[PDB]
Design a protein around this nucleic acid. Structure first.
Ligand SMILES: [Mg+2]
Length: 1037
RNA sequence: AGAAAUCCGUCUUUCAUUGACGGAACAGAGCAAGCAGGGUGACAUUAUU
DNA sequence: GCCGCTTTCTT
DNA sequence: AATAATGTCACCCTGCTTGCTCTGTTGAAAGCGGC
DNA sequence: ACCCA
């Protein structure tokens, strides 16, 4: 089978005033018709029966809840605009049972008990269906009969069975001549009876073709006429007759197809209310037009069906969450846990939900055992817990809660305490959970065959300026009600460059004239002579480069074979153009010669890729069941040049320290002039010279962008206590920092550090507004107040946020492009990546959550997933569980293999942070990764002959003054490695070195460490290799 | 069928009328968190009397 | 063959 | 025994901000009559 | 576990 993809383009229409009136009026007409279809289909779907759902559900492998599918169509949370029969939440179960003739399911209970937003109210759509029957003047059962026909013909979507596009318009209201269904039904059943009791099953299709022709009394040239009356798209049976007599025959496939045809054409389309419905629609919309009625129907039907499907799934998920909540409801331990706030440790006035992460989670057990281990005197067992449970990611537990839980350890078990906390937060999430309202929405309308084909375009090409217009030929509705086609232009130099410009190449032939699809435009020259308005030069440049290419006979012509292009337009005049293109044949399973890759996402370092190949002989991998060979690894990079100099937009950290003295200087000059104020417990003002903080920032010689982020924090600190008068000089300093020289509005890469810098600058302006307007708990301040006080600076707030948004969008796009070019350059057909990565949650520290919000791991994954099929590259999502620590080609080849990560530190640079990490890893005698870090330190001590230090390391605590200082350990390693510049390998979490069994990273070199031969590899490249060699899917397998 | 238009964006103490470059989009609903001030409440380190 | 309409299609 | 510096953790508030997921859409393929 | 001082 032939796999394809979709690219799209997007711009704004530029009609003249007359055609603009026509277009806006037509769109308003379509929108009014869409609203009418929305209300009417709301009622119609309120009319469905359990039989209709059963018939639409019957052939589905997963069993379906017919009652829930009825409920999500009979009762809908809605906006005021489609609210016709308001029903109180209290009577939902009663009225549902009345309609269903049976007691409500528990999932339906959960659907009805769910919260809905402020502006949505429950609507009884079955009552609306009854009133619609009255409005049409037809009996309820007659409209139900027509509804059965519509759902049977797939004109409407019911449950898991989707609609067939907009065929409802042609089927119910069409003016033309229909199929002869009885002929088809009879022929189909007699061939199925001719083909289900064969005494020999042929391996080719020819005897079957002969049987079908004999059954239909037809030849191969007449079969379409005989079977379908020459009407409609070719059926499965026609295509079967058409194929070469030598193709392999699939009996089960053909029988399945014939069964579908028999099922779908066993009954007539014998309408009862066809003409009433058609008069109703024509009266409440416009006169019959298949396309316009289709557009109205599409908008309304899509809205309703997505909401009802979502509510079905949501109700089932809600029932499961409720069952879980009811299981953990041990109810006396729950109340002891929550009696904390009434106990004598909570000295506060405002309570909060006690969560599992407030209790140290799993590790609570350890605390428990210590209490029964060393009772009566607890407290230091509490702090050993807390101190061993510090992370830069996880929220740390609350002391007073642990203290209080000592008081009830004898009766409430750790099992049940954690169960109670989990119950707490689950219940909280469950009361908050909201059902989904049905709303028409703001989607635009699609004109079919809307774009003038590029070869038929009307070009007013000047020798020094190409015609850059693309014209739509749209049907528009005039005030008298007649339709007429009109020409409307628009500009899109991307669409012009990739598709629309006329190509004149003898041999160049490509899908899209863009670098990632293999085409590079020729460069401009000194004889190019661009002279346009400034706000047009970039677009102009593109035009020029196309002109030159046509001038050289070098511009390729699109090989896409476009016969029609649609255009989607909204009320704002925006136009969207989709282009479907074939990407090639659907790949089979891995064979020898297929190349695959994996990629690793990081936030302070580059993303990494690892490229592998399936081979005939060599390294066997059990999980893959084949021989593999490592090709190469690399950093994911997106480089642009400035007058010869290269910059990686994804990772550039800015100028080195000695390079930005002047900038630094001005900051210094400002900060000498100011102090930082602060309020003492006893309220009193305490000041500090603000320049000490600046010196602390400078001492470690940061690069420009970290320096700007830290200086932004310092400016925010300076702003805090000031008067209105002080805030004005500080304001000139703020503007100068933001806009001149190296401020964020002029300099900054796409790196994570730059995004954090911009957010810190926004923090400065926020603090300025809060200080100026005297914000407090008793005086919340607002945006209107902020704009009233200082519109310029408020506008910067918005501008900085827009800068961040554009940076992140560009960065996701560039990361995906870089990986895709790596794959295309190395003929990689398979990409594999973590669909697992964290976003944010309560149990995580706020700073980690904020960084993850700027990290966009999910966005990068989704972008790779969007781009890869455009080159017939298959992406698989996988779990990231332990992918930073597995030993490539050893792990699960055949058993688990894991090692810690390492850092290369000069012996010189080994401080107390190193000793802290050594001590901490040496007590890391725990499950998970810590095992491997404990091992690590062991090897370290063995490799550097530092066993005698071990005990000093185990007692190293960040408080102790008896701690072994760092210079002992530096002196020992200097003794042994010869000098103070010598690299020492220290086992550290997040280290960039991995000691690998095999050469699994480009540039890795072999060493012997603790008498084991190992490859010193980029740890991120190793993680990418692990991801590449993963085979089991995200959830489990 | 009407000569205009950056389609949307990125980088650089370099801002470019020949600098180097990147991108399927859209709608609604829902979920998750962040920030600035202001408050509460634990702990730790410094020192001291 | 184009344009604009119809219909059926289980790929 | 405290008081106070300075610093790290958590938990609230009002009003603003963004990332991500769900369920979809942007039709396919043939013949007709009038040009 | 991913993410990192
Ligand atoms: Mg990594």
């Amino acid at each position: 089978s032939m796999s394809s993809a979709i690219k799209s383009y997007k711009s704004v229409l530029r009609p003249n005033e007359r055609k603009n009136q026509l277009l806006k009026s037509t769109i308003q007409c379509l929108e009014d018709g869409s609203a009418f279809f929305f209300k009417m289909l709301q009622g119609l779907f309120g009319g469905i029966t359990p039989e209709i759902v059963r018939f639409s559900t019957e052939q589905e492998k997963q069993q379906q809840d017919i009652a829930l599918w009825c409920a999500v169509n009979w009762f809908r949370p809605v906006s005021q605009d489609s609210l016709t029969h308001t029903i109180a939440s209290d009577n939902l179960v009663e009225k549902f049972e009345e309609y269903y003739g049976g007691t409500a399911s528990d999932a339906i209970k959960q659907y009805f008990s769910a919260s809905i937003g402020e502006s949505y109210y429950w609507n009884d759509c079955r009552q609306q269906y009854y009133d619609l029957c009255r409005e049409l003047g037809v009996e309820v059962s007659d409209l139900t009969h027509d509804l059965e026909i519509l759902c049977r013909e797939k004109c409407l979507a019911v449950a898991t069975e989707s609609n067939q596009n907009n065929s409802i318009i042609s089927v119910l209201f069409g003016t033309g001549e229909k199929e002869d269904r009885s002929v088809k039904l009879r022929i189909t059943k007699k061939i199925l009876e001719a083909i289900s009791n064969l005494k020999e099953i042929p391996k080719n299709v020819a005897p079957i073709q002969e049987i079908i022709l004999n059954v239909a009394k037809a030849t191969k040239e007449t079969f379409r006429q005989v079977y379908a009356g020459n009407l409609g798209a070719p059926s499965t049976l026609e295509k079967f007759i058409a194929k070469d007599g030598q193709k392999e025959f699939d009996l089960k496939k053909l029988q399945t197809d014939l069964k579908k045809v028999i099922r779908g054409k066993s009954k007539e389309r014998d309408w009862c209310c066809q003409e009433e419905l058609r008069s109703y629609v024509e009266q409440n919309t416009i006169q019959y037009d298949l396309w316009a009625w289709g557009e109205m129907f599409n908008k309304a039907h899509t809205a309703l069906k997505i909401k009802s499907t979502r509510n079905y799934n949501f109700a089932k998920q809600r029932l499961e969450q409720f069952k879980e909540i009811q299981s953990l409801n041990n109810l006396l331990v729950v109340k002891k846990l929550n009696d904390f706030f009434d106990s004598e440790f909570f000295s506060g006035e405002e309570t909060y939900t006690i969560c599992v992460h407030h209790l140290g989670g799993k590790d609570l057990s350890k605390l428990y055992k210590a209490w029964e281990d060393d009772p009566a005197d607890p407290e230091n067992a509490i702090v050993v817990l807390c101190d061993d449970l510090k992370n830069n990611f996880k929220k740390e537990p609350i002391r007073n809660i642990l203290r209080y839980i000592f008081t009830i350890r004898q009766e409430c078990s750790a099992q049940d305490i954690l169960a109670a906390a989990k119950y707490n937060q689950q219940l909280d999430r469950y009361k908050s959970q909201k059902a989904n309202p049905s709303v028409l929405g703001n989607q635009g309308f699609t004109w079919t065959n809307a774009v003038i084909l590029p070869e038929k375009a009307q070009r007013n090409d000047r020798p020094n300026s190409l015609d850059l217009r693309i014209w739509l030929y749209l049907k528009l509705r005039h005030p008298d009600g007649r339709w007429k086609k009109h020409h409307i232009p628009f500009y899109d130099t991307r669409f012009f460059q990739e598709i629309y410009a006329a190509g004149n190449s003898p041999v160049d032939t490509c899908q899209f004239r863009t670098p990632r699809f293999g085409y590079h435009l020729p460069k401009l020259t000194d004889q190019t002579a661009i002279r346009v308005n400034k706000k047009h030069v970039k677009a102009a440049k593109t035009e020029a480069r196309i002109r030159l290419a046509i001038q050289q006979g070098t511009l390729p012509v699109s090989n896409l074979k476009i016969t029609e292009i649609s255009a989607t337009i909204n009320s704002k005049g925006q136009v969207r153009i989709p282009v479907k293109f074939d990407v090639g044949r659907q790949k089979g399973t891995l064979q020898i010669g297929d190349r695959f890759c994996g990629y690793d996402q990081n936030q302070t370092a580059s993303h990494a890729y690892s490229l592998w190949e399936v081979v005939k002989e060599g390294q066997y991998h059990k999980e893959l069941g084949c021989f593999v060979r490592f090709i190469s690894s690399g950093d994911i990079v997106s480089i642009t040049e400035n007058r010869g100099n290269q910059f990686d937009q994804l990772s550039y950290e800015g100028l080195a320290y000695p390079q930005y003295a002047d900038w630094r200087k001005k900051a210094s000059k400002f900060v000498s002039l100011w102090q930082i104020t602060k309020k003492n417990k006893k309220k009193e003002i305490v000041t500090v010279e603000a320049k000490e903080k600046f010196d602390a920032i400078c001492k470690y010689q940061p690069r420009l962008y970290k320096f700007n982020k830290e200086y932004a924090y310092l400016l925010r600190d300076i702003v805090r206590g000031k008067s209105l008068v002080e805030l004005q000089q500080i304001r000139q300093e703020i503007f100068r920092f933001i806009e001149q020289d190296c401020g964020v509005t002029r300099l900054g890469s796409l790196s994570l550090s730059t995004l954090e810098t911009v957010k810190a600058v926004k923090g400065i302006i926020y603090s300025y507004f809060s200080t100026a307007l005297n914000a407090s708990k008793n005086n919340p301040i607002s945006d209107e107040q902020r704009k009233e006080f200082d519109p310029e600076l408020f506008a910067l707030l918005e501008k900085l946020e827009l800068i961040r948004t554009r940076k992140k969008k560009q960065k996701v796009e560039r990361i995906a492009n870089s990986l895709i070019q790596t794959c295309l350059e190395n003929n990689i057909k398979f990409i594999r990546g973590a669909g697992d990565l964290s976003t944010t949650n309560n149990a995580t520290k706020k700073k980690a959550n904020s960084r993850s919000m700027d990290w966009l791991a999910r966005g990068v994954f989704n972008k790779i997933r969007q781009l890869a099929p455009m080159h017939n590259i298959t992406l698989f999502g996988c779990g990231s569980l332990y992918t930073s620590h597995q030993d490539p080609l050893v792990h699960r080849n055949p058993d688990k293999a894991m090692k810690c990560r390492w850092a290369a530190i000069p012996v010189k640079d080994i401080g107390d942070w190193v000793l802290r990490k050594l001590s901490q890893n040496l007590r890391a005698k725990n499950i998970g990764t810590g095992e491997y870090y404990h091992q690590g330190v062991k090897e370290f001590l063995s490799h550097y002959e530092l066993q005698d230090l071990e005990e000093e390391l185990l007692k190293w605590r960040s408080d102790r003054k008896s701690n072994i200082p760092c210079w002992v350990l530096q002196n020992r390693l200097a003794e042994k490695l010869g000098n103070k510049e010598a690299v020492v390998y220290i086992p550290v979490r997040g280290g960039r070195i991995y000691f690998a069994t095999h050469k699994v990273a480009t540039g890795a070199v072999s060493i012997v460490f603790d008498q084991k031969q190992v490859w010193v590899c980029n740890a991120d490249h190793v993680a990418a290799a692990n991801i590449a060699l993963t085979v089991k899917g995200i959830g489990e397998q």
